[PDB]
Structure formats: structure tokens, C-alpha cells
Design an enzyme around this catalytic site. Structure first.
Site, PDB file in Angstrom:
ATOM      1  CG  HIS A  41      -2.368   0.739   1.135  1.00  0.00           C
ATOM      2  ND1 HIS A  41      -3.112   0.879  -0.029  1.00  0.00           N
ATOM      3  CD2 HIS A  41      -2.490   2.065   1.675  1.00  0.00           C
ATOM      4  CE1 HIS A  41      -3.888   1.784   0.081  1.00  0.00           C
ATOM      5  NE2 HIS A  41      -3.737   2.364   1.236  1.00  0.00           N
ATOM      6  N   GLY A 141      -0.469   6.030  10.174  1.00  0.00           N
ATOM      7  CA  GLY A 141       1.007   6.174  10.392  1.00  0.00           C
ATOM      8  C   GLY A 141       1.429   4.765  11.078  1.00  0.00           C
ATOM      9  CB  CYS A 143       0.685   1.051   7.568  1.00  0.00           C
ATOM     10  SG  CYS A 143      -1.059   1.249   7.325  1.00  0.00           S
TER      11      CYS A 143
HETATM   12  C1  LIG Z   1      -6.322   3.464  12.033  1.00  0.00           C
HETATM   13  N1  LIG Z   1      -5.019   3.174  11.197  1.00  0.00           N
HETATM   14  C2  LIG Z   1      -4.502   1.685  11.177  1.00  0.00           C
HETATM   15  O1  LIG Z   1      -4.587   1.106  11.729  1.00  0.00           O
HETATM   16  C3  LIG Z   1      -3.270   1.745  10.001  1.00  0.00           C
HETATM   17  N2  LIG Z   1      -3.669   2.555   8.649  1.00  0.00           N
HETATM   18  C4  LIG Z   1      -2.588   3.309   8.287  1.00  0.00           C
HETATM   19  O2  LIG Z   1      -1.534   3.586   9.001  1.00  0.00           O
HETATM   20  N3  LIG Z   1      -2.383   4.171   7.091  1.00  0.00           N
HETATM   21  C5  LIG Z   1      -3.600   3.816   6.244  1.00  0.00           C
HETATM   22  N4  LIG Z   1      -3.488   4.379   4.914  1.00  0.00           N
HETATM   23  C6  LIG Z   1      -2.324   5.467   4.717  1.00  0.00           C
HETATM   24  C7  LIG Z   1      -2.611   6.719   4.745  1.00  0.00           C
HETATM   25  C8  LIG Z   1      -1.439   7.662   4.372  1.00  0.00           C
HETATM   26  C9  LIG Z   1      -0.147   7.168   4.358  1.00  0.00           C
HETATM   27  O3  LIG Z   1       0.908   7.979   4.026  1.00  0.00           O
HETATM   28  C10 LIG Z   1       0.788   9.601   3.945  1.00  0.00           C
HETATM   29  F1  LIG Z   1       0.919   9.945   5.088  1.00  0.00           F
HETATM   30  F2  LIG Z   1       1.866  10.023   3.127  1.00  0.00           F
HETATM   31  C11 LIG Z   1       0.133   5.771   4.432  1.00  0.00           C
HETATM   32  C12 LIG Z   1      -0.862   5.115   4.614  1.00  0.00           C
HETATM   33  C13 LIG Z   1      -0.794   3.651   4.833  1.00  0.00           C
HETATM   34  N5  LIG Z   1      -4.750   2.842   6.611  1.00  0.00           N
HETATM   35  C14 LIG Z   1      -5.688   2.674   5.592  1.00  0.00           C
HETATM   36  C15 LIG Z   1      -5.297   1.486   4.745  1.00  0.00           C
HETATM   37  C16 LIG Z   1      -6.375   0.868   3.891  1.00  0.00           C
HETATM   38  C17 LIG Z   1      -6.021  -0.164   3.203  1.00  0.00           C
HETATM   39  F3  LIG Z   1      -7.009  -0.521   2.154  1.00  0.00           F
HETATM   40  C18 LIG Z   1      -4.823  -0.530   2.798  1.00  0.00           C
HETATM   41  F4  LIG Z   1      -4.457  -1.753   2.348  1.00  0.00           F
HETATM   42  C19 LIG Z   1      -3.894  -0.039   4.071  1.00  0.00           C
HETATM   43  F5  LIG Z   1      -2.491  -0.951   4.178  1.00  0.00           F
HETATM   44  C20 LIG Z   1      -4.030   0.819   4.673  1.00  0.00           C
HETATM   45  C21 LIG Z   1      -4.703   2.285   7.926  1.00  0.00           C
HETATM   46  O4  LIG Z   1      -5.492   1.521   8.028  1.00  0.00           O
END
Ligand SMILES: CNC(=O)Cn1c(=O)nc(Nc2ccc(OC(F)F)cc2C)n(Cc2cc(F)c(F)c(F)c2)c1=O
Ligand SMILES: CNC(=O)Cn1c(=O)nc(Nc2ccc(OC(F)F)cc2C)n(Cc2cc(F)c(F)c(F)c2)c1=O
EC number: 3.4.19.12
Lengths: 298, 301
Positions: A41, A141, A143
């Protein structure tokens, strides 16, 4: 004396955690020998998160589109294995512990090192639920935070965090990138399924309670088939003979046969706790394995 | 989201843990710069452990009577001294893994992570609270003496607890890192036991805020109260007094949730008066008091 929810010491894992940046997306990565493991992701952008074509998104990047920091690593190879990315780097992690990748089974436990921006924030223990979720604590963050068990000097990594489901529970993959459960790495509606209680674990915890002086809940006996009927009514996992076998050493140490402990559990299920506590808890606890109990109690 | 009893990552502390042996008595020590800190109980033999004369046992020792082992590395002891209930062993090598650290003495209600250790080998980490009766509800077996509690702030470790003993009710008593016990306890066999304990009121309110931030809302009621009226209820239920300082400390959580501290107090009041009616809050069927307002912010930010 005492019994507590206890994580493995996190130092071996802490020295492996990196930040992985691909364009404007960032998350956590796991640096072991000359390879950084992270969730795929990381190659999506805001636009892509709903139904990304990972194969196609990946082709649009080469070895140098990925920024690994923990310092700096120079990426010299990349590959997608299932739902994880493997980034070959030029430097072997001098802090690499002896390790193994393992796919755990439902009801087993592990320690989670919750990380943000490649930096460790906390550690806690939890179970792979029967429905292949975990009930963690993660914010945006986190992930790529990993779960593991330690056997003396060897770290068995079993989990990499990917996402939070709409219901507020968590899903992720083994370190070969195959999800636990039916989940996919896209932001769609995803049904977790019925979350049943890990029966063998609840029994283990009742043994832990007897070892620690909580005994009010003992008594009647029952039968496996009779107990299993009560199990299904209360959404408890069915109890098998292999489970009775795993509980052998606790039974042996306490002088309480498994089926006597089941009859004790029946009364708790059918009658509740009548305002009393067991190991300071007012409900039945299912995130200690029989091994967990033994380890802590000796 | 989600909410868990969460410890600090322990690696910074793992690298300071050593084994200290005196004759056949062994336990854990903490190696920071060129000093090893441990419980003075280590200079007791079996025959001394009941009613020890620590000054006497100490004077009869020389540096070479103390074996300090940091993993495989035998350290050489070049000075020894006693400070309150700890021993301070000067060694010829500074610990290359010494974090930035401080020693702090904590107040009842505050939490810390414990790294439970045996034979100078770390075995697990969990969170604890200093109870109002000055004990902690840990998990410790024989050989855990000298295990430490700590908090971490950025790269700095604040050491606050060294484990000494288990009381007859199965709870745990220990010292700060200058060797002064928490509570009235002593490092000898006496009639000592844990006082009657109370609930850390400000921690319960912080955990209620945490519940709100995670979507638990059922306990939010239509009432408000005064600090005075609330404190009358608390006293009845063996809760600690809530002070205006506590109200001030809870300001941030109030601002994030938009529920005024006194409105949350009135919710807690109803919870204490009527019980939880078989409902749960953050997966618990009791009111939890081992999260500080800090702990809540840390995990919901
Ligand atoms: C409550 N949150 C969680 O448990 C974990 N989580 C997360 O940390 N990040 C998410 N999306 C995202 C947003 C921004 C980003 O970088 C940016 F800052 F530059 C990077 C990422 C990966 N998500 C959503 C998610 C949805 C999916 F369908 C996925 F496959 C996935 F890996 C993550 C999280 O849940
Ligand atoms: C459940 N037990 C505990 O929480 C802690 N605990 C412990 O770990 N060890 C103890 N005594 C002991 C025995 C043998 C020994 O050397 C040998 F193992 F090689 C070394 C020691 C320290 N005690 C008892 C104790 C009593 C006191 F009065 C103390 F001051 C004290 F520090 C420890 C423990 O409680």
C-alpha cells in the site's frame, strides 16, 4: 505471584524498524539482512486507495523511487510478494537478530511493536482472533508495525499490520504478505465475520487464576459434547481433544482435570460472574494461551 | 483506534540489565555509565535474609566479592557503596549502551513500564501503576529482584522503580533508584502488609475520555455536578479526591472531546451510584484506573 498481560522484550525488533517513503506516502518497514519488508500500500496515492492495480502502480517506479531511512539505505532491487514489498538494500542490518517468518494459527498470541514514522512507540500482547482479526491499538502511520514471538534469541515474526476495518479492528499479513482472513489491501467495505471466543485460552486463564489463588469458581463435572453445546450457545469455539491435550501440563500442576475446568466454565457462562472478579477482570479473558500461562508462571 | 495497556519499547533498558552475584545470592542490576545499581538484599546469605544487619554484612565485603555479568561480559568491580536500600557498584567499564536517563520518584497514580528480568535476562514488559497504598500489582517470581520500572520521553529513560519484594497478599513493593521504598515497607521479614487501597479518580476520568474518543458513549448523561458534590460521592466509593489541579490536567481531553470535566464527573457519579448494568466500556466490565491522562493522550494522538 501475579498474572499480567505481558509482551516479549522489544529490543531485537526495535533495531529493525525503518521508515519507507514512496513519493508522498510513508509507513513502517522491517529491515532484516539486506532486505526491507513493507506493505505494498506504500505505492498508492490518495486517488489510488479505493481499488488500486498494484502491478500497474509498481511498474511506474524503479529502485530509486523508494526512500528508506532509519541514516539512509540505497535500494538496489524491488519485488512484490503477495501484499508485501521486498526492497533489496546495499547494507545488511548490523542489528539483525536470528529470525524466522511464521504464519500463526488463530488463537495464538504475539507481541505487537506499534511504530510510527519508523519509530517504536509501544508494545503490547494480543491474539489472532478466530475471525483473523486482531484487537490492537493503532492510529494513522502505524502501517507496517510488526507482531512477533521470541524463543530465547530467535524472533519469529508472524504479523505485519496493514489496516483498520470500519468496525475498529485490525487486519494484516504474514511476512510473506498473505493476509490472515479474507481481507484485501484496499479501502472497501469488508466483513470481519462472527468473532468467537477462544475456549482453550479461557481455560488456560482459569488455570492461571487457580495457580494465583483465585479459586471461588471451582466445583460438578461435564462431558465434552455437553460442554460443546453450551459453547455454541455462547459463541465459544468448540473444544477438541487436541485442546484437552494442550492443557495437560496445567491440569497436572493444579490437580484439576480439563473437564472439571469446563464444568466450571459452563456455570460462569450460564450464570455470569455474580459480581466477582478473576485475576482482576470482570469478564472471561481469552488472550492467554496455555503456553503464555506456563511461561509467566515459571 | 482501539485501546490497550501498552508498555514503552524496552530495548533501551534491556541493554542496561545485568546479573549481580554475591556468594550464592543473585539478582538483577542496572548498569548505567560506570555504575551498577541493585537491591542491597544481594549481600545477604540465606541465614541473614530474615533480619539482616546490612552495615555489618557490607563492611565484610571487598570489590571482588561482587560478580557482575552483563550478558557474556564479566565486569570488574572497582568500588562499592550503599545508598538507602540499594548498592552502588563502580565498575571499570562504562556501559556503551547507556541511554540518556534520569531517576525520578513517582507519585501514587502514575504508571510505568516494568521489564521483568531473571538472571539479568529480560523476559517481558507490561504496564503498572503505583497504587495509592504504595504497592504495584505486577507479575514477579523468585529471581525478579532488581527488575526496573521506567517511563520513556523521546530518547530519555526516566527510571522510577526497582523491584524488591512480594507482600503476603501477592502485590509488590520496591524502591526508587536512590533506594528509598515506596510506602512504609522495609527490606527484611516483618509483619508488614499492604494497606487498604483506593481508586485513582483522575485516571478513571481519563479512561472515560478514552472511551468517548473510541466510540463508547452510552455512559454520557444529561447531568453536571460540582467539584464539591462529586468529591462527596468519590469519598463514599473509596475513590481518591479530585482536585482543581486534576481538573486542569484533564483540560486537553476535555478540549478534544468537547465534554466538560464536570460533565464527565457527573457521568462517573452515575456509574458509581448505579453500576454498569452489565454493559462494557473499552471491553472492560469495571471502571479502570491504571491509565493516566498522559497515557490516554499518547495512545489517542
Ligand atoms: C487506524 N489506522 C491503522 O490501523 C493503520 N492504517 C495506516 O496507518 N495508514 C492507512 N493509509 C495510509 C494513509 C497515508 C499514508 O501516508 C501518507 F501519510 F503519506 C500511508 C497509509 C498507509 N490505513 C488505511 C489503509 C487502507 C487500506 F486499504 C490498506 F490496504 C492499507 F494498507 C491501509 C490504515 O489502516
Ligand atoms: C515473588 N518474588 C518476588 O517478587 C521477588 N523476590 C525475589 O526475586 N527474590 C527474593 N529473595 C531471594 C532469594 C534468593 C536469592 O539468591 C538466590 F536465588 F541465588 C536472591 C533473592 C532476592 N524475595 C524475597 C525478598 C525478601 C526481602 F525481605 C527483601 F528485602 C527482598 F529484596 C526480597 C523476593 O521477594
Amino acid at each position: 505471584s501475579g498474572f499480567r498481560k505481558m509482551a516479549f522484550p522489544s529490543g531485537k525488533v526495535e533495531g529493525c524498524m525503518v521508515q519507507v517513503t514512496c513519493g508522498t506516502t510513508t509507513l513502517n518497514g522491517l529491515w532484516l539482512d539486506d532486505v526491507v519488508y513493507c506493505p505494498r500500500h506504500v505505492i498508492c496515492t490518495s486517488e489510488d486507495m479505493l481499488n488500486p492495480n498494484y502491478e500497474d502502480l509498481l511498474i511506474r517506479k524503479s529502485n530509486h523511487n523508494f526512500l528508506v531511512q532509519a541514516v539512509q539505505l540505497r535500494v538496489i532491487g524491488h519485488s512484490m510478494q503477495n501484499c508485501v514489498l521486498k526492497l533489496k538494500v546495499d547494507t545488511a542490518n548490523p542489528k539483525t537478530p536470528k529470525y524466522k517468518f511464521v504464519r500463526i494459527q488463530p488463537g495464538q498470541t504475539f507481541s505487537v511493536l506499534a511504530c510510527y514514522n519508523g519509530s517504536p512507540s509501544g508494545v503490547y500482547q494480543c491474539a489472532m482472533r478466530p475471525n483473523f482479526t486482531i484487537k490492537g491499538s493503532f492510529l494513522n502511520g502505524s502501517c507496517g508495525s510488526v507482531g512477533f514471538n521470541i524463543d530465547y534469541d530467535c524472533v519469529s515474526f508472524c504479523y505485519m499490520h496493514h489496516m483498520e476495518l470500519p468496525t475498529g479492528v485490525h487486519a494484516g499479513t504474514d511476512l510473506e504478505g498473505n493476509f490472515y482472513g479474507p481481507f484485501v489491501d484496499r479501502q472497501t467495505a469488508q466483513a470481519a465475520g462472527t468473532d468467537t471466543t477462544i475456549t482453550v485460552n479461557v481455560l488456560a486463564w482459569l488455570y492461571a487464576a487457580v495457580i494465583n489463588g483465585d479459586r471461588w469458581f471451582l466445583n460438578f463435572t461435564t462431558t465434552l459434547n455437553d460442554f460443546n453445546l453450551v459453547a455454541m450457545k455462547y459463541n465459544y469455539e468448540p473444544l477438541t481433544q487436541d485442546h484437552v491435550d494442550i492443557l495437560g501440563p496445567l491440569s497436572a500442576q493444579t490437580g484439576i482435570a480439563v473437564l472439571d475446568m469446563c464444568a466450571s466454565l459452563k456455570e460462569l457462562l450460564q450464570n455470569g460472574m455474580n459480581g466477582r472478579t478473576i485475576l482482576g477482570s470482570a469478564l472471561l479473558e481469552d488472550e492467554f494461551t496455555p503456553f503464555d500461562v506456563v511461561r509467566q508462571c515459571s
